[model samples]
Target: LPAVVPAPAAIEQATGAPFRLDASTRIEGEADAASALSALLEARTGAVIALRIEGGGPAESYALTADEASVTVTGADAAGLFYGVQTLGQLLARDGDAWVVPAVSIEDAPRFAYRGVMLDVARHFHPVETVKAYIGHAASLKLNALHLHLSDDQGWRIELHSRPELTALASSTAVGGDPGGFYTKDDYREIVEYAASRHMIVVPEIDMPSHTHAIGLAYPELAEITDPMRETAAATGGALPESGTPYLGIEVGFSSLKIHDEATYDFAADVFGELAGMTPGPYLHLGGDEAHGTAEEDFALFVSRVSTIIADLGKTPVAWHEAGDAGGLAGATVGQYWGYVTPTDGMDDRARGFVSNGGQLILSPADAIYLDMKYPTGPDLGLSWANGPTSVQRAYDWEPSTVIPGIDDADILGVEAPLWSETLRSLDDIETMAFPRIAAAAEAAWSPATDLRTWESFRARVGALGPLWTSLGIGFHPSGEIDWA
Candidate 1:
């Protein structure tokens, strides 16, 4: 027999050989799942496993060897079991047709509390199925955060039942080069539930103070007394404008609004509350980046006030790094550093300002993580603004923990690879921008060692995984034109 093991049994057999759960390990609320998985492993491996669920906290661990077994879940919850399973998965081997026990002793914990990826569905909405599939993929890679950039200049992807105007009017009928789309509350709820099952948190980013063009278009008053722009027809022909062009201009336009207005903060609070209710995750991302000069004064006020609103909801508020000056708000936000002007060297005065303010940072410098940028000239030189290319190598080379002379990596949370949909129109476009690069990103996020698999080696591994994408009819980036040389 090739060491046959059932799902729960496989974990137990592999873990039982080298590890054992102790009673001191707390299982807060996940007693049932944790006990079941533990019993299964003990039954299959003929080893004693103990569990402890006492303290009100969240942590789990496991140790494995040839003859000893130990696993500890600090919290009693299904999530604890899920975490235990992940450890068990890392210790098993494929022996002939079945999984075989591996003699290994390993200790692991996440380097950054927030390791995230942002998907810009507002620019070009992906179907509910597509978003769910992406979450599944993220979970498989052990990524814990999925940031959904749900609103922007181009569209509003999430439907707000409280404010129908958000989706009813501002959402484009067609985006990129395809028909426009939006997701229903039910659709969003499904994504939330699915992500929770896999131990991943789904953070919804509703860009505000700026990038509210879609909202302003639907309800002009939301613009806060600023003169509205003429409604231009959606571009149907020719190439899409560079993301920076409209992004910069619109940001400037909306920056002029009255930020202290009670109505404005109320609107943001209502929207965020609605999102927090639908999302199971404990954190919510309020896009506070890219505040244009046109609305700088208004933006400053909005930034200061929104922080209070986020905290009141019993959820943490994460914002782009640009909101550094909002005073006290920085502590409550996860600053996302991205944009053409964000320092490339990762050592800029502005970036420093964010850290000095007690804010945690997510380094997504456009030069390093912007997937929509064309490979060589990127979108900028190609059909859009040429901000330089973000090749697979560039993404892999980035290290979030690397701090400049004065800065510390502890201030940094991790990294995120952003997929902005300026030139990306269809599923094919999304595939080309996400893959190979995403694989590199996943490795960088999870594996602490910088020693990376070469492009050739990764390609081989990715090839084996291609069937998974193909079965789902995913239009992945073709290896032939990836330019590994």
Candidate 2:
């Protein structure tokens, strides 16, 4: 059987000649999926395919069958059909002078409904084209969400009409004093439209409390004063935020919104209300991580109120696992866990609080799926944080069910690989850091846990994707662990 990344739920090899894909071959079914397949094939093989729509299977599920004379891909919906097309793209191989798909039967369905990939555009700004390119890359893996970290201490990467001063003052400098930029409303809408066409939802995040030093630049009244934590961060090479100045630093947990000030809540409402209006997706992530300078009580008060504001806008709130400690957090607020694979520092307890509060969790265990972590022996582009130098094997080996004790699969909203761009300055840098590791995250999100989902099988299957990735112009790090085909 052909190796498919995220390993399909079931695939059977048929005893027959492989189906040849050539100039004469045609693709017909589901206009959207057919168009997607046409685009994929045209890019790689210069073949134009055609479209029809039929319905009925499980949600996001597909059945693909290929024999000597013909091939067919049937889906439960357009998304399923699109995913099947992605699988079909992976199945393409060189047979002498022709591109062919093996005679096989594949039935596939996603294990989780909210497979996502997060890109932190705040640390270092990425242009709209880069983000759209990333959408193509992520959608090819059947990941359904693009979580854009739009605001942080370093910069605000989204332009909000309600808060124009945010971009005016803060969207100018990145970590290490590199140039920074923000997405205009039109640019953001273009990305949303493109992502939607690829069947992916955009989850925009406006990090608060802690990672809000830049907010001080625009509205000093709304920001908290720097504390000893800021001093410590400055002593360790991070820049200190000054009123009316861009942060341009990488230290987290130092700055925050004024928790005691009612004006802070007003600011939150304006920002989130505008964000809610712009976002069509179900979730809005109010970052509730690393508020080290915030008093425990104050942090809780801020997260809970902000969460409520987002909920009041009719969108589900998502926050870092730390927000789970907020007793009054909006019901059904998804908690994103960025802890290590092993439970530590009571982070697991905090993460489980979301489930206890009638919400689900998105597991992104830092050690295993933080894409910005440096490679053990590859390009010198990523950071050493989160238990430094994550090997591709390390990325593929952990099980989501085993990460947080008592938090079972039902509590898991999905899995996401977050690529924080403190070190990643460009789309190529982002790709090199994310590709193979992101694939590991995809399997965790979409495939059921089983013996077949082992490192050996994954490495082999992912290794086989080298040609496809290459054809797609993905500048993936050729990690040594994979015997790339």
Candidate 3:
């Protein structure tokens, strides 16, 4: 069997000679896939292949076959073809002096529709260039959604035209006092266009109520008064998040907006309303996680109202699993479960509510897929919050269906790996943390559940990707877990 990560649904070895690629070889198929393939081969082999892209394929399916005479990739749709091209790139290997593809026939498609990777720019803001580079990395794995955690207590990272003060006052610093920044309207558009070209959609998140301290920087009237706990904490040690100042701390659930104030709703309407216009994707993430300071009823009211506000703007509302119990949450509001693999603390119950309400779940089991968790060994970065440090095998061994009881395939939207930036500060840091684990996430999100998809097979197949990833300039962590070829 060939070494293909996120092992294809089916594969059959062809009884023929391998196909050779030289100056005479010509790629003829979907234009986008062709162009992408051309760029990929040029980078890996220093051979500039010719390109022409045309579109036609299954919704998200592809078939690829290669033999001595020629190599062909057929798509059920453009995305399918693009994915086929990705698998082909992985298949390329050196035979003596020439570049060649082994003789094989393969069929591939995603098991879930929303294979995603979340990057929290709010903690340590990444520039647009870094975000684009990350997009390339995710798209290569056949992942389709780029979920940008655009706001949190550390900073507000998007330019809202209606609420000009957000970026003006709040977007200037990050966790640990690192420099902060926001995506200008044009900058955001460029990201969307770049992602679309890669057959991926960008999901934007604006965490509400609890992570609203930055909003206070812009419009203090909408913010809750500094809570007694935060004030008491200040007396015991750290500084309070005062009005007109940037928050450099990483604490959560302490800050919130004045939930009962209509002015707070007006502020949310302006922020998400402008964000909805700027985003072309069908979903808007209204973060409802960790609202510790807001009263339980108030938190429910805030999530329900904000979710409805987003839904009214012609976009589906997505929130953290915490919002699942908000009875009035807008219909079809997707829930993202960030709990551990085994149920604990009633988190599973919250996640199931989304399914009961006709919404799907996007599982990001913290101990398994949270990319920022420290590797047991390797680079001196990342935090250890998710069950001590997470090993690559831990990342690969879990099944999505078993995380929350009663949540099955149909009720699950997809799987995502979140790279929260609290401890990260550069693109290199981001790459180092996300690589091998991100591949694990890709397999869970794209490959079907079966005996063929095992940790042993995955480790070997992924080990083969080291060279390709290195050639493509991916700074993946060399986890001892995989015997890199």
Candidate 4:
């Protein structure tokens, strides 16, 4: 299909016998991948096929071939097989009355190791089922990481036996005064395993120090009592969120932990220590953004301390662009850039710091790919905080290698599209912002640096996905810009 996203590495048209998929067709190859594909094709083809682990192709590389007799997909590894199977679903095209896969061969592999989509669960808690569904959606785009922003000023979304009071006291509310929730230990584990089944890793974020108003509610000792709350109505343009109150407003940077207090470190240590053990991924996100209230020295100190804590656990720490301001952190820590597509106010300096520390950078230029940003001229229910509304072209246009000075493909880790949920609530809300934009991000992260990644090809490829998206119940915006096929 021309709409196949993150576009395949090489696709060549082969004339020969077409493989017709019907009730009696055999889905032979790897067991699990075959079974998955069989399930996907079952409803349309009138039958399901069994998957076996019997196959071959490189890790995450796959080759597909079809002839008159049968069709086969050989994967370098299981993940490669899964992706190949997924690609088949998109290739299904109608020929008169019979359904047939195009007589073509596709060999595919991703350009970068990490392709991520971040969800701010703290802004609006997502149930386990919804989380799983989101995983399915991202996997469909060939995205490999689910970066869960698990905590913020508003609420805590994961339970920790080390600090039971966190979710117990703070998980009952969300933004806009909506109902909030948290995931129990078992719930979190289920999400991890389910994501693993789809060949994706869960990068859990325990937003420290600044997004800790809810933490203060649970443990008063960890909070920094301040007068900022007294003028929050005027300062934040909303009612003040008390130390123990559930914050329903959207403003950030007002709350932070007691920077110099030893107790603050203890609390962070307990929370992240428990989280570190549970997370199988190598990176832990320690949010070090929007601490406007905390002085520069104090903010730097807090970042260094928590970054060290995460590193000592043998896991790489990821922080916001602001964390790069601190030099005491381990060389392995990653910096996430959420600034504009164009550098401003020395934010570029912060992004460069990660490379200086022998670590790569994860570029998340907010104006471009912040998924929750509203569309330029469409019916979009999202925030406009990133300068103005973002169009699909805006999301697709950024060049990752050239964004930061001296940080080309090698120093750059990969791209991540974050969906900040201050204005989003339901799964539909997520689908609307994520679908087309996420596809753009996938190309930025996975496609090679060539003419293939251009906007002309991307718009057509994404437009062709309308039918596939609808089949999966994805509520894509149906934007007017693209001629949805």
Q: Score each candidate by Cα lDDT.
A: 0.57, 0.83, 0.82, 0.78
Residue 247 of candidate 2: its Cα lDDT? 69
- Sort every candidate by TM-score, greatest first: 2, 3, 4, 1
Between candidates 2 and 4, name the one with more favorable lDDT: 2
Model 3 clashing-pair count: 7
| Ranking, lDDT, top scorer first | 2, 3, 4, 1
Q: Provide C-alpha RMSD values for all models, in order.
A: 8.1, 2.3, 2.8, 2.7
TM-score result, candidate 4:
0.93
Q: Model 2, residue 280: what's the lDDT? A: 94
lDDT of 1 by residue, 1-485 (tens): 11111111122223334333333333233545454444334312344333344434434322222334433433334444454444443333444554333544333334455656677787667787777767655554446788898987777789897888878876664344455668889788887777776667788888887667667666666653233343232443333332322221222233323466677777888888888888767777877754434454555567767776777888878777666655546466464555424454343565566677776677675666666666652423212233557665665555655522246767766667677765665656777777656665565555553322355444444444454445444555654434321
Q: Cα RMSD for candidate 2?
A: 2.3
lDDT of 4: 0.78
By summed lDDT, the worst window of 10 consecutive residues in model 1 runs over: 1-10
Taking the tens digit of each residue's C-alpha lDDT, what string does model 4 give over 1-485? 33478788887777785667665775664657766786566426423232323345445777766555666666777777787787777777666788777777877877777888999899888888878999988887778889999999889999999999988898988888888989998999999999988998999988886877888888878776344533546655646555467788777776788888898888888888999999999989988865666788888888889888988888888888777778668664454555545556658777677778888777787888889999987665887877788889888777777665567678877778899888888899888888788998888877776546878888998888787788777888987778886
* Winner on lDDT (3 vs 4): 3
Position 196, candidate 2: lDDT? 96
TM-score of each: 0.70, 0.95, 0.94, 0.93
In each prediction, how many residue pairs overlap at the backbone (N, C-alpha, C within less than 3 A)? 34, 2, 7, 6
The deviation in Å at residue 175 for candidate 2 is 1.4
